[PDB]
Amino acid sequence: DFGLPAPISPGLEATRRHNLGWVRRLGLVGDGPSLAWYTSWDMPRLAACGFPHARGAALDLCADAMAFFFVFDDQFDGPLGRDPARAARVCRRLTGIVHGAGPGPGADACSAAFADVWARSTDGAHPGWVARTAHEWEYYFAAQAHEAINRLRGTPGDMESYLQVRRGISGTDLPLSLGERAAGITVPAAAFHSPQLRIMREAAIDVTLMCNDVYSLEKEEARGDMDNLVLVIEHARRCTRDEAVTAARGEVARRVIRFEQLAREVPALCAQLGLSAVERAHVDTYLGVMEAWMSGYHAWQTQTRRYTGAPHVLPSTGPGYFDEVLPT
Numbered sequence: 410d411f412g413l414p415a416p417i418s419p420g421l422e423a424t425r426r427h428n429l430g431w432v433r434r435l436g437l438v439g440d441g442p443s444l445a446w447y448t449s450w451d452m453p454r455l456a457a458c459g460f461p462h463a464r465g466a467a468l469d470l471c472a473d474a475m476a477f478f479f480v481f482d483d484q485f486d487g488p489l490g491r492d493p494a495r496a497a498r499v500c501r502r503l504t505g506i507v508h509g510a511g512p513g514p515g516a517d518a519c520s521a522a523f524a525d526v527w528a529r530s531t532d533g534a535h536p537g538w539v540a541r542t543a544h545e546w547e548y549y550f551a552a553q554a555h556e557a558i559n560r561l562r563g564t565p566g567d568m569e570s571y572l573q574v575r576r577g578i579s580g581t582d583l584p585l586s587l588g589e590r591a592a593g594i595t596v597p598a599a600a601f602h603s604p605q606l607r608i609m610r611e612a613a614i615d616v617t618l619m620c621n622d623v624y625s626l627e628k629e630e631a632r633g634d635m636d637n638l639v640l641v642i643e644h645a646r647r648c649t650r651d652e653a654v655t656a657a658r659g660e661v662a663r664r665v666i667r668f669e670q671l672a673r674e675v676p677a678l679c680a681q682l683g684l685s686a687v688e689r690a691h692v693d694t695y696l697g698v699m700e701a702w703m704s705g706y707h708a709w710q711t712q713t714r715r716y717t718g719a720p721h722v723l724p725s726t727g728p729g730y731f732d733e734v735l736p737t
């Protein structure tokens with residue numbers, strides 16, 4: 410019991426078709442085991458449940474971005490994730506794409522897929538959205554090497570260090586930046602940076618990564634992963650696994666409560682700032698984007714085959730992928 414309500418975009422089926430063609434055309438997913446395994450994740454349902462405001466090509470972008478995140482993530486479940494210098498170099502290649510240097514023809518599948526997601530994301534976007542989201546991507550790519558450092562250390566970090574690494578490797582605020590973009594809204598800066606919306610944005614991202622930590626612990630613990638809230642709590646408190654899971658549930662619940670308490674202040678905040686009716690509408694949609702990411706991510710993770718299937722399809726005795734698609 411995380412304390413989250415149940416959630417979908419009507420573009421689910423069209424996006425399923427588009428996204429299957431996209432991952433195969435780009436070389437992220439092959440034929441056979443990799444395609445079956447990818448399909449079992451149900452990236453279209455994650456997009457439709459996590460981004461219910463997205464329609465048409467906007468939902469396509471959400472599903473393709475998710476596909477990139479998950480395929481790229483799994484490439485570190487192998488030697489790359491025990492090699493911080495190599496991880497830092499591979500991730501520097503991707504960061505160069507973020508800051509404007511496109512990969513060119515014949516780039517590897519991960520570079521090509523990311524370049525496509527990023528170009529589609531920024532096309533027609535407000536410059537303030539582009540600048541913020543570019544730095545979000547930089548954090549995401551740069552954090553991976555620190556997760557590898559922690560694996561070599563073999564102990565979980567303290568809570569502060571766990572949050573600094575885990576917020577990065579989880580994709581930081583990128584799901585919410587994507588949801589804003591896909592909903593076609595631009596949050597007014599005066600509202601975006603209110604203490605209420607800053608705390609809410611941070612809480613929503615923490616909620617989803619902590620919910621994921623609980624559901625993905627089984628597939629991660631056996632690989633020597635250290636940046637998982639359950640392991641962090643257990644190590645810090647010297648408590649039982651059950652006590653640590655219970656505490657993790659409470660960390661999520663307290664953040665949901667804080668989010669909802671602050672959400673109640675948002676109508677009055679928009680009035681204090683003198684926002685226009687359209688601006689208030691965009692803020693209201695942004696609240697729904699955050700609410701839907703929290704509830705939709707969790708709904709998806711209860712139905713996907715990624716977490717129950719991984720230890721059997723890709724046991725910890727081998728890499729967490731069928732094909733190497735990321736040159737190192």
Ligand SMILES: CC[N+](CC)(CC)Cc1ccccc1
Nearest residue numbers: 478479482579580617618621
């Ligand atoms: C955002 C997608 N992600 C992290 C990059 C792919 C592995 C899983 C994830 C989803 C939701 C919360 C935390 C992690």
Ligand SMILES: [Mg+2]
Nearest residue numbers: 482483578579
């Ligand atoms: Mg990861």
Ligand SMILES: [Mg+2]
Nearest residue numbers: 482483486625
């Ligand atoms: Mg992972």
Ligand SMILES: [Mg+2]
Nearest residue numbers: 621622625629
């Ligand atoms: Mg996980």
